[PDB]
Design an enzyme around this catalytic site. Structure first.
Site, short mmCIF file in Angstrom:
data_model
loop_
_atom_site.label_atom_id
_atom_site.label_comp_id
_atom_site.label_asym_id
_atom_site.label_seq_id
_atom_site.Cartn_x
_atom_site.Cartn_y
_atom_site.Cartn_z
N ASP A 144 -7.12 -23.67 9.96
CA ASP A 144 -8.29 -23.03 10.99
C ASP A 144 -6.93 -23.25 12.42
OD1 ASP A 144 -9.56 -21.19 9.39
OD2 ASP A 144 -12.22 -21.65 11.16
N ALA B 221 8.41 -14.38 3.80
CA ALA B 221 8.47 -13.81 2.96
C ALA B 221 7.17 -14.22 2.38
CB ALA B 221 9.07 -15.10 2.11
N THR C 214 -11.67 -17.50 9.73
CA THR C 214 -11.93 -17.07 9.05
C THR C 214 -12.82 -15.26 9.09
OG1 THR C 214 -11.41 -18.73 7.05
CG2 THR C 214 -12.47 -15.92 6.57
N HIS D 168 -10.38 -13.46 11.14
CA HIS D 168 -8.72 -13.16 10.00
C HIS D 168 -9.86 -11.66 9.36
CE1 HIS D 168 -5.75 -13.57 6.53
NE2 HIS D 168 -6.78 -12.84 6.28
N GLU D 169 -10.49 -11.73 9.00
CA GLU D 169 -11.17 -10.65 8.67
C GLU D 169 -11.33 -9.52 8.83
OE1 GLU D 169 -11.02 -10.44 5.10
OE2 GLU D 169 -11.15 -12.76 4.35
N1 AES Z 1 -7.68 -19.95 9.09
C1 AES Z 1 -8.36 -19.00 7.76
C2 AES Z 1 -7.08 -18.18 6.39
C3 AES Z 1 -7.89 -18.05 5.74
C4 AES Z 1 -8.23 -16.99 5.27
C5 AES Z 1 -8.33 -16.55 3.89
C6 AES Z 1 -8.26 -17.44 2.80
S1 AES Z 1 -8.33 -17.12 1.52
O1 AES Z 1 -9.76 -17.39 0.72
O2 AES Z 1 -7.64 -15.44 0.94
F1 AES Z 1 -7.26 -17.53 -0.11
C7 AES Z 1 -7.27 -18.41 3.12
C8 AES Z 1 -7.11 -18.85 4.78
CA CA Z 2 7.02 -10.45 2.77
ZN ZN Z 3 -6.76 -11.57 4.87
#
Ligand code: AES
Ligand code: CA
Ligand code: ZN
Ligand code: CA
EC number: 3.4.24.-
Length: 262
Positions: free
Chosen positions: A235, A203, A165, A168-169
């Site tokens: 993850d 998509a 996470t 990603h952020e």
């Molecule tokens: N590996 C984690 C990726 C991720 C990051 C954020 C979310 S969410 O909280 O926006 F639904 C979901 C999945």
């Molecule tokens: Ca798209």
């Molecule tokens: Zn994001």
């Protein structure tokens, strides 16, 4: 030769119940993951489909908990702030001491990471984290991650217990967009772009653990690059950035975040 950019991090733990005051080891375990993922040193990069092996990027970024505070004094690089707040939202209450969170350190010198226990979208959906893209304001620059999705030990829970996470952020913090293009509900799901040529047009977000190939938007036979960090998969399934994304990251480091360069 790659110029390795070394980003000082301050982690602001904002805790209500004692278990939310996560351990130094859990915090350190997250930094360890960042220093693998952003250097292409995560061993699970081997999961990338071979057809895309030549696209996997080393972003040349490393992270460390700050050793000097903003006024030059010794620090652990971790702040720990008790709060009476039970949940935080994308409106940035966690980023101000006056709204029960903790003030940001100067955004031109530090990556601020806030960790809290419950995080919700503006319409009440639980989320794992959120970022601020480059461009200011400094007061709220950084990323926020829920503690159950932070680090690889302690309170981290499957399937978000491999530290991705934050990878990603921080991708967003470095100006990367969701690989699927963030269409609104009424738009054609194949219409928007993440502005990266080597990420296949896709998509929707992928969740969970998809099977290769997962085709959408006529991108067969290889399908979605759902193992890219900027998808939404579990993850253990996201393991790579592309060279096309590294181009955008390099532009971010060269422009709006040039203050982090040596
Ligand atoms: N590996 C984690 C990726 C991720 C990051 C954020 C979310 S969410 O909280 O926006 F639904 C979901 C999945
Ligand atoms: Ca798209
Ligand atoms: Zn994001
Ligand atoms: Ca693309």
């Amino acid at each position: 030769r790659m110029e390795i950019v070394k980003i000082p991090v301050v982690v602001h733990v904002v805790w209500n119940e004692e278990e939310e005051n996560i351990s130094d080891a859990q915090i350190q375990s997250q930094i360890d993951i960042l220093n693998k993922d952003f250097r292409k040193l995560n061993s699970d990069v081997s999961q990338v489909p071979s057809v895309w092996s030549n696209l996997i990027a080393d972003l040349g970024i490393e992270f460390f908990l700050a050793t000097k505070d903003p006024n030059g004094n010794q620090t652990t690089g971790i702040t720990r702030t008790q709060t009476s707040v039970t949940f935080f939202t994308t409106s940035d209450e966690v980023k101000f001491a006056s709204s029960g969170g903790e003030d940001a350190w100067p955004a031109d010198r530090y990556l601020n990471i806030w960790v809290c226990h419950v995080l919700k979208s503006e319409i009440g959906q639980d989320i794992l984290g959120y970022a601020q893209f480059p461009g200011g304001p400094a007061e709220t620059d950084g990323v926020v991650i829920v503690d159950a999705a932070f680090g690889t030990t302690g309170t981290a829970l499957p399937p978000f217990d491999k530290g991705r996470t934050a990878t990603h952020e921080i991708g967003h913090w470095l100006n990367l967009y969701h690989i699927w293009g963030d269409e609104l509900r009424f738009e054609d799901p194949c219409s928007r772009s993440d502005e990266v040529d080597d990420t296949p047009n896709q998509a929707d977000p992928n969740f969970g653990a998809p099977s290769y190939p997962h085709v959408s938007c006529s991108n067969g036979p290889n399908g979605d690059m759902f193992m890219n960090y900027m998808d939404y998969v579990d993850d253990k399934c996201m393991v790579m950035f592309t060279q096309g994304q590294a181009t955008r990251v390099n532009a971010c480091l060269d422009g709006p975040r040039s203050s982090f360069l040596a």
